[PDB]
């Protein structure tokens, strides 16, 4: 019998990347070819498959610092932060390669099917 | 608010 | 030019909401009249107002438990930490005077808002 | 997916 609000949940991730933007209670750093990222570990889990791997590990979930495969592209990983932060994915001509490889090493589903089907349109 |  | 994927945010939070059911990178205990409720300081700070003005203090952003009012009705506090994780809220006859009153100390409008709009209903 |  509950009742429910529709924005909220829009209205918990734009305050998650308010926090982010303001770098309040990020407690890792994402390592990408030397390039820094700075985010929360609950939200890289609620996001990625990888992640959520990651952090579920018994060692690794004290981890501040996480070094990422270096065939790994500091762009595409850019692009797909700002997808977890805002539910909008930067998918363009130019990085569609590297975005669709990082979503498939950070286990990233739904941003994967997308990059195929776009890349299938230009075909 | 809506009924889910 | 950003794609936008509608079901992103609410994934987000179910999933933030099954690390919360695991006790997963929980990193505060919020103490109600002596019960206690594990959340995640990030998901706090994204619903309420008073969580984020808590969290954003350069003392108590450190602080592993947080005591709240002793007015503060640990039913109502329940119901409100539920709506922050799921988006739903457990409306009914006998708890609403208690959740509008804990939901206008942890500062949610929104909850405050319909509480308000169900009572004028009634009377 | 979506044009927001
Ligand atoms: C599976 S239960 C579960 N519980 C909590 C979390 Cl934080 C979580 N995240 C996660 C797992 C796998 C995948 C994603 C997120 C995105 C994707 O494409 N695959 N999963
Ligand atoms: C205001 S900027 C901002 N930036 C980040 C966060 Cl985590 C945040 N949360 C927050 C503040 C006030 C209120 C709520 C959440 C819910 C409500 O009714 N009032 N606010
Ligand atoms: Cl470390
Ligand atoms: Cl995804
Ligand atoms: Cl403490
Ligand atoms: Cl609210």
């Given at each position: ?6 924005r909220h949940?829009?209205?918990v ?16 750093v ?18 990625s ?12 979930c ?6 990422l495969?270096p ?5 595409g990983?850019?692009?797909?932060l700002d997808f ?11 990085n569609?390669?590297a975005?669709?490889?990082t979503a498939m ?10 990059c195929?089907?776009?890349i299938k349109a230009?075909? | 608010w809506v009924?889910?």
């Amino acid at each position: 019998s509950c009742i429910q609000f529709t924005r909220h949940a829009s209205d918990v991730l734009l305050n998650l990347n308010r926090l982010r933007s303001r770098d309040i209670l990020t407690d890792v750093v994402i390592v990408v070819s030397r390039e820094q990222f700075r985010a929360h570990k609950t939200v890289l889990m609620a996001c990625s498959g990888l992640f959520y791997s990651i952090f579920t590990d018994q060692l690794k979930c004290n981890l501040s610092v996480i070094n990422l495969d270096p065939e790994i592209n500091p762009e595409g990983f850019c692009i797909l932060l700002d997808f977890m932060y805002t539910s909008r994915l930067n998918l363009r001509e130019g990085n569609i390669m590297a975005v669709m490889a990082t979503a498939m090493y950070l286990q990233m589903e739904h941003v994967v099917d997308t990059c195929r089907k776009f890349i299938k349109a230009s075909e | 608010w809506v009924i889910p």
